[PDB]
Point group: D2
Chain length 487, copies 4
């Protein structure tokens, strides 16, 4: 691939920063492409382009906007397999995942918001015969989205779909680890008829390009997906610069509670899907699995059985369902967590090492890893690993497990396995998390708002509420009576 350029105002354009970076294929170590990095002057160009495109976009009818987003949806469906293969090359996720999930659910959200544009309404409030109020849900203007590397094009769609549907232009910065699919999406939008400037894509690094966006005085909102620490830095700079509105989708340490009446085959299946999809690189993963003491030994055997069925290998093979981690530096961090678990006395049930042999020595592979006999003070239990590392924790009673599930600064997701009507709702209602699954894990419908409690996030994505949160309310009073001054 040739020097990948910036995408500004409906065309690829060379960056004026003079800086570049490389994205690596995590399966081979090869350079996928050299990518231009947006400089401070490039960000300002992108903002002025976005201001001009947004005015055209907002002036269109609601249904005209809806039709253009729907054309982008149709193109995404057509190009699913091509885009999935590129995503696999950039992220290391198996094609069996990227071709079935990444673009499908990204497009599902764009399709959803495309249809809701005409339903975006203000309100009207009578005060008295001589005065009333009405409100408008106006675009914020130019907004910025900052993506993460685990679901690059899905995240770009989940941020840009409500932003565009609400009448804004978005400047999107993909993660430096995985910048390629965002640039393809930018071409797809314009091909669908999106006006020039409404979706600009600026590859770059967080310390420079990301910061230039968070500081710009004419960007009205920042939406960020990433780690808890990076989020705090982003939200601070966005505030100190121009008091921007903020959305944050950060990591978690989500609990999966297995009830005493749970079927352990189902619970083990849910625990598997909550830990080893995308090689464990999912913010919502149920990485603390609480199991009753009386069932723990049997559950551990059922986990070992299923871990043995995991099929690592060629990411383009049909039967491969486990990939390398997104990068070699990230594998290093995941390995440090694994060593921490060993040094603190957690019992390694399986995995714990890199994969070796033909087809693995050149990739950032980590074996599916399960620790058991875990306790609430362990580093692997307290901190998000963002790798394929399950922690199993024994518990005795329902009140106890609720307290321990909630005793964390994280708040993203949670789940319970139980056939009992009262227990399922009763437990779920007490858990301090924004995304809660009963007898399942991971499904995130376009209709369902998702985001974190406590340190796991600010605001929400998806659902009707996220379309409204990309508008700002203007209240208008019409006074038809005589105005009275006290002077």
């Amino acid at each position: 691939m040739a020097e990948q350029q910036l995408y500004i105002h409906g065309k690829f354009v060379a960056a004026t920063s003079g800086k570049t970076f490389e994205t690596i294929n995590p399966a081979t170590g090869e350079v996928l492409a050299t990518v231009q990095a947006a400089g401070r002057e490039d960000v300002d160009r992108a903002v002025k382009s976005a201001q001009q495109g947004q005015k055209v976009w907002a002036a269109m009818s609601a249904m005209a906007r809806s039709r253009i987003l729907r054309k982008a949806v149709d193109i995404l469906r057509e190009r699913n397999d091509e885009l999935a293969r590129l995503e696999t090359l950039d992220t290391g996720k198996p094609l069996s995942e990227t071709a079935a999930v990444d673009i499908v659910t990204g497009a599902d959200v764009l399709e959803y918001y495309a249809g809701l544009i005409p339903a975006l309404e203000g309100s009207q409030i009578p005060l008295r015969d001589s005065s009333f109020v009405y409100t408008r849900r106006e675009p914020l203007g130019v907004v910025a989205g900052i993506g993460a590397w685990n679901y690059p094009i899905q995240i770009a769609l989940w941020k840009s779909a409500p932003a565009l549907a609400a009448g804004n232009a978005m400047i999107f910065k993909p993660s430096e680890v995985t910048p390629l699919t965002a640039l393809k999406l930018a071409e797809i939008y314009r091909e669908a008829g999106l006006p020039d400037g409404v979706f600009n894509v600026l590859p770059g690094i967080g310390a420079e390009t990301g910061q230039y966006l968070t500081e710009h005085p004419d960007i009205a909102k920042i939406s960020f997906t990433g780690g808890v620490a990076s989020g705090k830095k982003v939200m601070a700079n966005s505030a100190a610069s121009s008091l921007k509105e903020v959305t944050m989708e950060l990591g978690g340490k989500s609990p999966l509670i297995i009830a005493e009446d749970a079927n352990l085959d189902l619970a083990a299946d849910i625990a598997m899907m909550a830990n080893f999809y995308s090689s464990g690189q999912v913010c919502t993963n149920g990485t603390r699995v609480f199991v009753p003491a009386k069932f723990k030994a049997e559950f551990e055997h059922k986990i070992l059985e299923r871990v043995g069925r995991i099929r690592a290998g060629d990411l383009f093979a049909d039967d491969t369902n486990f990939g390398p981690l997104v990068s070699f530096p990230h594998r290093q961090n995941v390995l440090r967590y694994i060593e921490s678990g060993k040094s603190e006395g957690a019992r390694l049930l399986c995995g714990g090492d890199v994969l070796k042999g033909e087809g693995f020595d050149n990739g950032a592979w980590v074996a599916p890893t399960v620790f058991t006999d875990c306790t609430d003070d362990m580093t692997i239990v307290r901190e998000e690993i963002f790798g394929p590392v399950m922690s199993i924790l024994s518990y005795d009673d329902e009140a106890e497990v609720i307290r321990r599930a909630n005793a964390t600064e994280y708040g993203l997701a949670a789940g319970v396995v139980t056939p009992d009507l009262n227990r399922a709702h009763r437990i779920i209602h007490q858990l301090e998390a924004g995304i809660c699954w009963i007898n399942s894990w991971g499904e995130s419908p376009a209709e369902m708002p998702v985001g974190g409690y406590k340190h796991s996030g600010i605001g929400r994505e998806n659902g009707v509420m996220t379309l409204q949160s990309y508008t700002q309310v203007k209240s208008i009073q019409v006074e038809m009576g005589p105005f009275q001054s006290i002077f």
Copy 2:
């Protein structure tokens, strides 16, 4: 003098463990109203633990049980309106003619409004397929903190605490160090109304310490702040860096008042007066850039002079007084520096511009009502919020021009237009970059109407149904009744 004022934690007054105190002054006389204890770091932690325990009791009650308790507080506030207004006048220097008609009346209106909406707070249900559906809960945030400003102390305490409590939260409120007294009275009223202990705690103190300890505390889920634009940026930064708190910010503005070429100039002048000189100019939404057509500027200036001459400064408890001192001598000094900036930058002084002198004024920080004209967009008095009684009059030629100039600011709080024309009123208002827009009026802020700033003037909103919802957090719950399939 009043008795020494303590912290209010868990349904009773309690001594601070900081060992620190400050004084609140009567802005009209300079006398010490009271010595006030300042909450330390340990006091904030005690307040948070009290709030956590109270919130659980409050949230477990029925919706209508909560509604009835807030309504009892409303009834008390109506009965004690005049007494609370007199205290507010002593602490702020605002005339009783204002405080007895606006401050508690509109604060209680918002509490009364939210009290009735508690039972209407609902989540959603979304079918996915025959075998699965989603439902959502609007759950309390938990413990939230409000940080008040000094210009409308008890109104702000009510506008923040009413939706927070109605949504099932406990709130720790920190009043401005300038004006702590009515917030402590409000805490007693809530308890008398039946609010569980800990649900509304009040921590007087100074911003550098008590305010910071609240924004840093790991177990406070949301900060709501009212104040200046600069102070706002600092609060929002500390709230994010510490524990990623949800935030609401109601900051200042430089709001434009646009007088159309077809406006009646008596109405326009009355609106401009009320948009600049209420509460002695100490109002975030004031219309401090008055745009008038060139052809009408001379006549408009004359009508402003007539009305400014009628402003009545004097005894703040007298019925005919409608203008008070500024809240402090340091704040007046800043307003005086802006006025001197207007003179040196070439704006024409139409009236006022000086401190008030003589018996009854020497002990207060009074500034005469001030009007500048012949102003231009580059002047400091036109670009920056003064927060004093200083009107800037700007001439303009055409509608496209005035919309551009009205919007060419980092502020975004309020705006208004004066015109009898249907098309012009809606057409102009729709293009203005502000959250609060008034047509042929100024200042009215109904409990139903969400209010807040665009751009640097704010984050989020207050009042209206949406502010009840914004004090909850959404939990989405998927019920999967079909057999779960694992790909491993």
Copy 3:
């Protein structure tokens, strides 16, 4: 008491019909009172009064209306016991019910709507830069409620609360069987500050006073509670006369489904409360109880045990929990249904006869009655009895009981008893009823919309939606661009 008069424009006034009727105390057979009947001229006077009052009422602020309704609530709480005693004399329901339910839940709904008045808002819809639409939710004007006799004051509150909260005036006609508490409510409203004419009460008979209301050209909506047959007459006349909006809360034959995993003590408690409260005179009663064949014998035993604890007697006694039927003519109809059950081959498990002895010979008593071995073709199974008659039906599988529960023209309520998460939601989602209870029966929160599918009703009561349904939408387009004529 005296000769009960009409209530028009804030005062008691003599009827101009020249006609009266009597309401009987169902416990003694004695005449409680003679009540004047509103004629066609009385209805026209009530309507003109309502038009005048509604204009005053709607011109008030929203919070002014809220406070007045709240004062009525405070009065109702204070006079709960007094009002309940009057209700017991008129209806025959035990004081243990009327003092705990009738006024309490009537007032709860009024209290609920009082608080929602300020939240009643229209909408605003941008079309293009030069045109927008806004809507107003305007009062209907004058509406009429026609109450039933089983819950006289509760029904008066449930109809009048949303109607008044929406800015309307209501003319209320109580059932001729039970007119007394409705007149008390009219006094309470005026004492609370309700403008004269906003709530007028016209006692009379359905054949005359009710028909005059449904025919009046200046009444905008009729809300009716009663039997299915009477409802069809009312809704037709409302259509033929002036095309009125209509709400109908009619009877049902609601199924109670006991699952194979149900606790039979719980199922029996639910079945008892679903059949014998208010002596079986409740539209929502679960009068078809479906029980699995394998448990039928045990369930019947548990029902008989609980039936033996039912305490009929002095309606003002604390421990009395069962009363006479509302009238002797109604008892005659209930007895005919019981004899049909006997003759069609249903097995009589208990009851089936009037009660005899000192204190019962003078009242319209029917013993708690249970039939079992019932089949879907029996008259007692297909038709609403509106008396204390439980029908127990055996079933074998889940698909069958859903088909049989739904195989009816009625659609009011339904319920299931089961501890299983999937079974509770799965079954309830398939039942064709508007009011569904899981592991409970009867609770009707002010927040919860209630009403019938199929022949059991039109529209809903309670919930936010019922406040909205007492307004009518006006859409207003503001065209700020130049209008183009093609002529």
Copy 4:
């Protein structure tokens, strides 16, 4: 000539078993366009069992699957716009200049609108206490019936079927016996888009038989009817008497157009023209009572006559034709009876009042554009809907008077005001008793905007989000997780 037209049941054309047929006439020539089979009792029974089967398949699909199928129907309607418009012109007599720009365009706009809203159709969740909560489902009604009118045949079929299908129902549509042809084309288009067989069935026939059989059928859950005020009352009665069906009714009106004393009279004249002579006056919302201030009446009359003189009747397929014949010869007879009453009751005829004559008109149901003035509130032409091209001009003196006279009617469908004044426009409109109100325009009916009548002009609404919800029924579900308490 066209082939004999059959019923459309379960995804295919099928012969009626009634043994009866009727003819639809081309109103421009008097010729038979087609012979059309009429559905009997048994045909209606068969259509219902088909609809019951199809609805189950349709409702079981996901929301977005339903959305995509309706969007494909939209795409076909856009592609086939001109062909469908030409057929509508043949059946109705409306000029192609109208049908190709409005009828299918706005019909498809509403289908497109509801297609996108399907995934947003949500129930509610209500917490009661920690141990119990309520949630609601918005379930399909099942099989619903739509009964169309003849003035906008395919638009009405789309406005009724779009929310009904989008909400998960099947609809059986009966077109007017006057204009059955475009509804049958719509049924084929729906199937081509993937609509499951049975979800949209079409039963041509006459009101006394096919219409009544539908309103009486026990397994139809809701009836939506558009037509005349009298026919509506009969439909609503039979629907109640049979099985207590939910009802929607869009009936006629006598809508007032109020010209204010400050109105520009050219704008007022253009609005009045569009409010009276579009579709040859056959529009339920037409502004047939034009209220003009006395001081402007003579001049207003002159501007109306000038614009009436520009009306171009002729070949309905010509670009410049903008006026057509009435839909049928019996309908012209009724319009002529109303015109004669206006003359006999003393109203002044300004123009028109007779049929059009000559080559190209003698065989069509033509009535000249007609304007009466000096009208009074007691005249038959002022009190009753004519549904032809007859404008009544009424003088007035003051605003209170015209509001009272505008409202002094049993009709309530639409209304409008012409004024440049902000206060006058909103003030007057807020007092008018009509569901559809236009300020400085007439006739536009956005898919987003609920429309329907006050008083005798209707029950319920069409279009907007509320109409999607009104084609569902609410089920409230209480989950009790606490121990149930029996008093027995």
